[PDB]
């Protein structure tokens, strides 16, 4: 099926600028549009998209509709100008999908064999790479219930090709690039580490909160198996983990030995040559 | 059952684009013909063809486009 | 001002065949060979096969046919004019 | 209605531009490969991600993108002229027996060509090198071109005729390369056989050199030499050569190797001409009165076509009377008298060896 999707900055902005379109008039609900995907292989890619006016009542929180004439002739517009582009699904700005979002995909399954819905985020806050990806699939259940659709999460990544790189790479004008080797890896050690702390923290806060409030199910199903997967590896020594310690010490040997070698070479060349050209410039001019 | 006239309209509109993009014959050329398909190393399908020009050049193209291998050997 | 019109009339080009009303194929010595249409100022029956013509090489139209073909000044040397030395 | 839209969706694939042909020359790194356009500019580009350079190799016909010029698709082998030299067909086979004479011309060329194909062991049993070609000449008598033409559809297997005319190629007569371009598939389709009529006018002497069009000739000869002068083994190709005279070819061709054997035709004997009339008298039906030796003893010193055509011309001269079947009477007159006019221009037909 669909493993991972490539979300370019162009489609994300194409939702967010429409969040300015209906956002200046407001008010509630979300920005929904039709997603134009490009499938070269099992890995999915996204290039363009277009948004359609959408309203959803709360009464009746399950009522939703889109304009098919807009989806039809504009697809005829975008397929005309670009024959490689076709609709792989739809999208919305969330932030969290209400249970009614399933039937939208079930309606457009006539257009595409598998429609992947992309939740997006117009205002960056947390925790990381924005948006989200959900693919329409029927997993049934291990409990043998009548088949129901719980959308499986698709990992989303940001990328570009050529011209879409040109625009944004000039538009940054913000932080140093990269710089490779010094600030890069250590700031990533802060972000990936600390955002990994509050991720599982708030996620384990939901683990206990769902047991405290929100039952049923809730708990079951995956709770006992997933939590035991957390209890798979504690994981400490003795024994072989002690061997990995001084083996890792034996690994840092070579690299730091080489470090002292570069120290001697850099100090030799630079210091000797600089003092030469220094003492020479002083004794000749003075 | 009434969509046959609608499909007749889309093949009239797209063949109108075949009237503007045939794509028009203008430059005289000559051919080189072959059949190919690509296994890897996933699996895909298609075919290719070769061409001459009036400027002496030669090109490697997915099979014509518009008329097909029906005729001829170059 | 009179330059922009008719200036692109290059290149002098001989035609090849006409299968039906709209179509023509023309051949030049630039190596360019084209099967291409006309400018509306040119009537089909007034034109001859293998005829040097004017063309706008963007559209590759038919501008005007030009009768002459060859030959260079060895003709104009061989061809002579003016009178003298009478009866 | 639906199939028309399918041709429309066919055309929805055709807006994609066709790539540019290429020959991978050599390589530098995994992102850099020496390649040249057919018009001469040399480039280094990156490949696509499906290929390994084992699927490319240096000196490989390939294709490149129209913008990035990246290596994408390819075909190893192509050419225009090859298969289009194949399609000339001779009735017979049985035309073998329809050439009349002559045995040691007929039979030996079978041992010169056929047996090399099927049983090269009989060459290595004795240890003799295989003859890689053959030579006819003339024209005392005639049939050098038909006996070739006959054996082609007779011997079967694989054979490719070489039309001797168009090689000059107008501008840039370098087309001696095309012989290698033909030899390359002769090394591919091997075994295959080659007949050549007219090696003499492409056998130019450069004896006392002059002007220009001779230089392109002599240069087109140098490759023919070197192709047989290899550096290569052409044994699976059988080169058959015939022309007006075996004289002007210069000694380079005249040695074995390039000219493997000496075979020719002379004026067919009246005994063998007795048989040459049968294959002429077979397709024509007349009244049953015939003496074959009559025309053979009356009409003397001719050729198979010269006899036949005039023998048919006699039937055509005799059918001028509008009567259908004709006894040899008119033919003992017509073929006699008509060929007498035809033997007026038999003058100066005797050429050096
Ligand atoms: N019995 C025959 N019937 C018809 N044609 C014949 C016969 N014998 C020889 N020929 C002709 O002789 C030709 C080859 O001789 P060639 O040297 O080309 O003719 P010429 O001697 O007139 O130059 C063959 O192509 C063939 O047509
Ligand atoms: N050992 C040999 N000594 C002399 N000539 C030979 C020998 N072996 C082959 N040849 C002849 O030399 C010819 C090829 O010689 P090559 O030097 O390539 O020709 P050229 O001298 O015209 O370039 C063949 O036709 C063959 O008959």
TrEMBL record, chain D:
Binding positions (ATP 3): 100, 141-146, 244, 280
Binding positions for Mg(2+) 1 per the UniProt entry: 145
Amino-acid positions noted as binding ATP 8 in the UniProt annotation, renumbered to this chain: 255
Binding residue positions for ADP 2: 100, 141-146, 308
UniProt-annotated binding residues for ADP 1: 98, 100, 141, 144-146, 149, 308
Superkingdom of origin organism: Eukaryota
This protein's GO CC annotations: cytoplasm; nucleus; proteasome complex
InterPro entries membership: 26S_Proteasome_ATPase (IPR050221), AAA+_ATPase (IPR003593), AAA_lid_3 (IPR041569), ATPase_AAA_core (IPR003959), ATPase_AAA_CS (IPR003960), NA-bd_OB-fold (IPR012340), P-loop_NTPase (IPR027417), Prot_ATP_ID_OB_2nd (IPR032501)
Alphabetized CDD domains for the sequence: RecA-like_PAN_like
Binding site for ATP 2: 100, 141-146, 244
Residues reported to bind ATP 9: 255, 258
Binding site for ADP 3: 141, 143-146, 308
Pfam assignment, any one: AAA_lid_3
GO-annotated molecular function: ATP binding; ATP hydrolysis activity
UniProt domain AAA+ ATPase: residue ranges: 130-269
Sites where the protein binds Mg(2+) 2: 145, 197-198
Binding positions (ATP 5): 100, 141, 143-145, 244, 308
Binding site for ATP 6: 141-145, 303
Chief place where the protein resides: cytoplasm
Name of the protein in question: 26S proteasome regulatory subunit 10B
Naturally occurring in which organism (per UniProt): Homo sapiens (Human)
Gene: PSMC6
